[PDB]
């Protein structure tokens, strides 16, 4: 991945190794030059999410203003579990409504 680099932590510009024929990153500040990490370079993406695990409801159990389930806390163990959805501006991000136990925090999904 495109990072900085030791010495003078700074941006890293791309640079091919013609002769050799391999990846190689570098910076415009100093001279440092490290090998590549993958053929990939830049990606577009028109948008298809941006949450995956939205780490991590680690503050849902203490959210007096939230709903709760009843028993069935996959793994861990115990009853009572807070849930909730996402809904961001546009969609249609269906409603991957998730959950979290009060005595744990296992983001146990569900259909």
């Amino acid at each position: 991945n495109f990072q900085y680099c030791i010495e003078c932590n700074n941006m890293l510009y791309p640079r091919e190794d013609k002769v050799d024929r391999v990846l190689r990153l570098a910076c415009r500040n100093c001279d440092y030059s490290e090998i590549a990490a993958t053929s990939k370079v830049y990606r577009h993406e028109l948008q298809s999410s941006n949450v995956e695990n939205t780490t991590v409801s680690h503050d849902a159990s203490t959210d007096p203003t939230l709903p709760r389930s009843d028993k069935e806390c996959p793994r861990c163990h115990q009853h009572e579990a807070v849930f909730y959805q996402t809904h961001s501006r546009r969609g249609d991000t269906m409603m991957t409504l998730i959950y979290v136990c009060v005595h744990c925090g296992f983001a146990f999904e569900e259909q």
Partner: protein, 52 residues
Amino acid sequence: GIGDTIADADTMKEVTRTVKEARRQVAECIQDAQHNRLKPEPGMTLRESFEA
């Protein structure tokens, strides 16, 4: 007067019945569209075609 505004007692039981009997018609929507079984279309969207 008011009397002209107060529906029959018997026939008012049947009012409150067809109202609370349309809760069940939302229950089967608030929870059935959490299992992605709407669906939507047209005009969109999916959240809106639910509101609809």
